[PDB]
Amino acid sequence: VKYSREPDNPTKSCKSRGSSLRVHFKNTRETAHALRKMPLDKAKSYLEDVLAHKQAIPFTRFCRGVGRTAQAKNRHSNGQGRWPVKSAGFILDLLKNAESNAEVKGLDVDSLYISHIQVNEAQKQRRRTYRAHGRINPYMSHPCHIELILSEKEE
């Protein structure tokens, strides 16, 4: 409905969103953080390389305990990165949906770039796990809302 940020030129922009997606919020934020201000064509190939374990998504904020890899040194010097395929899959579907919206609007798909993308925490879902001495603890999931906007690159 209403996105946190509005495109500068509504006529030259398309958008898509997803709500209550069953994917870890922290992993998806890192993936989104790596795609901001990126051309649509490069973003799609970049996410496909993540699914192929050829390029890594750097982890900058929610990175405690994350392993170190050479595939992330170009974007993140200290080398912390991962390959969150599940987050990449949801974002890839959103990019394709936004691209189809561009075609209906007759935009130049070759010049589109990610002008806005953010991940918000959705309602937590509840399971439980069993602990020693007959105790029950929460076993929660952290789904997220995702919204993105693609804008044409103005000359």
Return binding residues: 130
Handedness of CA 110, 86, 14, 43 (dihedral sign): negative
Amino acid at 113: Y
Instruction: Write the residues followed by a gap in the chain (C–N more than 2.5 A).
Output: none
Separation CA 72–CA 78 (nearest Å): 8
Q: Is 54 in the site for RNA (CB under 7 A)?
A: no
What mask of x and - would describe binding to Mg ion in positions 112 to 151, judged by CB under 5 A? Answer: ------------------x---x-----------------
Alpha helices (runs of H) in the chain, residue ranges in sequence order: 25-35, 40-51, 85-105
Point out which span in 38-46, 60-68, 107-115 binds RNA (CB under 7 A).
Answer: 60-68
Q: How far is the CB of 62 from RNA (least distance, A)?
A: 3
Q: Is 67 in the site for K ion (CB under 5 A)?
A: yes
Q: Is 10 in the site for K ion (CB under 5 A)?
A: no
In the complex, which residues of this chain contact K ion (CB under 5 A)?
Answer: 65, 67
